[PDB]
Amino acid sequence: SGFRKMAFPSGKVEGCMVQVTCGTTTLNGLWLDDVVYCPRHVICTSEDMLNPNYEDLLIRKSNHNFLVQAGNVQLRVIGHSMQNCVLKLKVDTANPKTPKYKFVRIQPGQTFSVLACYNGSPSGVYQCAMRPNFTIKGSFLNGSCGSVGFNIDYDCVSFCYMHHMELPTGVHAGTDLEGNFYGPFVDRQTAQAAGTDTTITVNVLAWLYAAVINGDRWFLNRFTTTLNDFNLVAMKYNYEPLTQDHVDILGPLSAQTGIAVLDMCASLKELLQNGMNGRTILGSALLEDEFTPFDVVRQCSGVT
Amino acid sequence: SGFRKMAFPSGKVEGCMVQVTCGTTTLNGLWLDDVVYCPRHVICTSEDMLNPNYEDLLIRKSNHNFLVQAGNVQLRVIGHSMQNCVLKLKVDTANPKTPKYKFVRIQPGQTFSVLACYNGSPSGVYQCAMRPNFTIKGSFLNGSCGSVGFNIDYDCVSFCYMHHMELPTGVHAGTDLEGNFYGPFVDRQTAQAAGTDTTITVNVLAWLYAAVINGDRWFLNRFTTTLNDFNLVAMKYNYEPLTQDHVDILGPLSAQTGIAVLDMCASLKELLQNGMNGRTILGSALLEDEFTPFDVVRQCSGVT
Numbered sequence: 310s311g312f313r314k315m316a317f318p319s320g321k322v323e324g325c326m327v328q329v330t331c332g333t334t335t336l337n338g339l340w341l342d343d344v345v346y347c348p349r350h351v352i353c354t355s356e357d358m359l360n361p362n363y364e365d366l367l368i369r370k371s372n373h374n375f376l377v378q379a380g381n382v383q384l385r386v387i388g389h390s391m392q393n394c395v396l397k398l399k400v401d402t403a404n405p406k407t408p409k410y411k412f413v414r415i416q417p418g419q420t421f422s423v424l425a426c427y428n429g430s431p432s433g434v435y436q437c438a439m440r441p442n443f444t445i446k447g448s449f450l451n452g453s454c455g456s457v458g459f460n461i462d463y464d465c466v467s468f469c470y471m472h473h474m475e476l477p478t479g480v481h482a483g484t485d486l487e488g489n490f491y492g493p494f495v496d497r498q499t500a501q502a503a504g505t506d507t508t509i510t511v512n513v514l515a516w517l518y519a520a521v522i523n524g525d526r527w528f529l530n531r532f533t534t535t536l537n538d539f540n541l542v543a544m545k546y547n548y549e550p551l552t553q554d555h556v557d558i559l560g561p562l563s564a565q566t567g568i569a570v571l572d573m574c575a576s577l578k579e580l581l582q583n584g585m586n587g588r589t590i591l592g593s594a595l596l597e598d599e600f601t602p603f604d605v606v607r608q609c610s611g612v613t
Numbered sequence: 614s615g616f617r618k619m620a621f622p623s624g625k626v627e628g629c630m631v632q633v634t635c636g637t638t639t640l641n642g643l644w645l646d647d648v649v650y651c652p653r654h655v656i657c658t659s660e661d662m663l664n665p666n667y668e669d670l671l672i673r674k675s676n677h678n679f680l681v682q683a684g685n686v687q688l689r690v691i692g693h694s695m696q697n698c699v700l701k702l703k704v705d706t707a708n709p710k711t712p713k714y715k716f717v718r719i720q721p722g723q724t725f726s727v728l729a730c731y732n733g734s735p736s737g738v739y740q741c742a743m744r745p746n747f748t749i750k751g752s753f754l755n756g757s758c759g760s761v762g763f764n765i766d767y768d769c770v771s772f773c774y775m776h777h778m779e780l781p782t783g784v785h786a787g788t789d790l791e792g793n794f795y796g797p798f799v800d801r802q803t804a805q806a807a808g809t810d811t812t813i814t815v816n817v818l819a820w821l822y823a824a825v826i827n828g829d830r831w832f833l834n835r836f837t838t839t840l841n842d843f844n845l846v847a848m849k850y851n852y853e854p855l856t857q858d859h860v861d862i863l864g865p866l867s868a869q870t871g872i873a874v875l876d877m878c879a880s881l882k883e884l885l886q887n888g889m890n891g892r893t894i895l896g897s898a899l900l901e902d903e904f905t906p907f908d909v910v911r912q913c914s915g916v917t
């Protein structure tokens with residue numbers, strides 16, 4: 310028992326972190342095989358950040374301008390290319406610690422672990438989710454750019470995020486490993502306001518199942534609801550609409566606890582309409598939405 | 614910006630996890646140098662758990678009864694001894710991935726990361742703290758025994774916790790790496806009720822400094838207090854008494870924010886007496902006490 314915000318073990322990703330310096334900017338790179346991935350804004354100066362033309366800025370850069378340091382040993386750069394908002398630096402040495410990996414683009418609501426890094430060195434690991442407005446609420450400082458977000462399926466690391474920037478509101482924006490930003494964000498020092506940060510309903514429901522499994526049951530009520538009725542209440546509370554697919558994904562949790570998904574929706578409806586009354590659920594005073602149904606099943610079953 | 618419950622990167626500890634089987638019990642062991650550390654309850658059966666006499670049970674065990682598996686290769690056990698509540702299994706091979714390490718016994722309030730494991734394999738990493746009643750609120754299942762808690766100072770891993778058991782109330786008990794339990798807990802299947810889980814005041818204050826640093830400032834008030842006045846309010850709310858040592862440890866945070874420690878105590882006093890009024894601080898609806906002043910400084914400065 311006990312339910313914690315749990316990150317994936319970071320070792321496989323730690324073995325991929327390198328330092329990339331270009332000009333006077335130092336950030337992090339991800340070394341997989343003979344390629345190092347890093348944000349393209351590494352080639353920018355103070356005056357470039359405002360309205361950079363990366364194709365133009367990249368012409369003035371050569372292979373020897375990208376300084377790649379793995380641990381404290383230098384990697385030789387034999388090629389460089391720009392793929393969307395990331396640079397792919399081909400090095401002469403394949404990463405000996407390269408795990409089995411995939412590049413995946415995640416959907417809003419999906420969770421992942423971040424291994425925050427500074428100067429190619431890991432400083433910490435935390436769990437977070439892709440918000441429905443395509444921001445992430447990370448914990449990043451200057452120099453953390455190039456830190457990655459990932460998932461693990463036993464031995465395969467699915468890389469889903471690369472950190473690029475902090476928006477003026479302190480929230481975070483980044484790309485998948487193909488260089489495409491999540492959301493409408495652009496790697497420019499400009500006014501980019503995020504959209505509505507709605508609550509990931511399916512995740513909240515999965516965490517209510519996690520609470521019942523671990524003994525916090527006070528919130529279970531004598532009511533039920535429909536998808537349409539629940540969604541009227543969810544729209545009012547800035548909660549994402551619940552679909553039949555979400556209900557299906559919750560099936561394993563409904564089966565283990567014997568609580569119908571729509572009964573759990575009714576319990577959530579009353580928590581939304583009445584508050585917690587100073588009470589807590591899994592040590593939290595708000596409804597937690599950064600655990601997917603898959604994360605709850607994994608933590609409650611002990612997948613390694 | 615952004616403040617997350619951040620765990621230490623787990624790679625150095627992942628390289629130490631092994632599977633220990635004795636009889637029909639399989640748990641985790643920590644392989645450091647030529648010694649494997651694991652809970653002594655690995656030698657127990659169903660009938661032993663109630664009132665085990667580990668010196669007696671250990672006589673019937675030999676080196677070849679302890680099955681140590683590192684990855685999927687077997688380690689030869691050439692010696693075994695009992696140190697308090699942990700077994701030290703001397704193996705013929707030194708762990709090639711042994712990091713620089715220390716064994717330290719932490720005080721209540723101190724935080725650490727746990728690398729939860731099943732069958733010697735890491736399943737996740739989370740951050741938690743030694744409660745003032747010497748329990749921990751982990752996330753552990755059957756088979757997680759032998760999972761460790763640790764801190765890292767650049768390259769040195771300070772091992773502080775080894776998981777041994779779940780109390781009947783779902784909370785967790787364990788030992789330091791010398792086999793001494795934190796608290797009055799004993800490795801027996803018996804009624805052991807935990808004492809008062811008081812709030813770690815100094816940690817809450819440090820997290821209020823973390824909130825001010827990241828822009829959540831609504832809770833800052835026009836008041837101040839004394840240690841004696843604050844402690845009258847803290848005793849009433851089951852908060853640990855604040856000492857001058859805690860005030861000193863908060864010095865770096867007081868200096869960076871320009872907010873006197875006693876001013877922050879007065880802000881905490883009003884949050885205790887008035888609640889949050891449906892508002893949040895660092896995305897939380899309760900006062901978080903699992904970040905030490907050192908953790909806040911580390912996360913806000915980016916120590917690697």
Ligand SMILES: Cc1ccncc1NC(=O)CN1CCC(C)CC1
Pocket residue numbers: 350358449450451452453454473474475476495496497498614
């Ligand atoms: C300071 C900080 C904190 C947390 N995360 C990231 C950063 N840095 C940036 O976002 C810098 N920024 C400059 C303009 C570039 C086009 C994109 C990168």
Ligand SMILES: Cc1ccncc1NC(=O)CN1CCC(C)CC1
Pocket residue numbers: 310654662753754755756757758777778779780799800801802
């Ligand atoms: C099931 C579980 C969940 C989370 N953490 C641990 C466990 N297991 C135990 O605590 C088992 N227990 C049996 C009696 C022994 C003296 C000590 C170990």
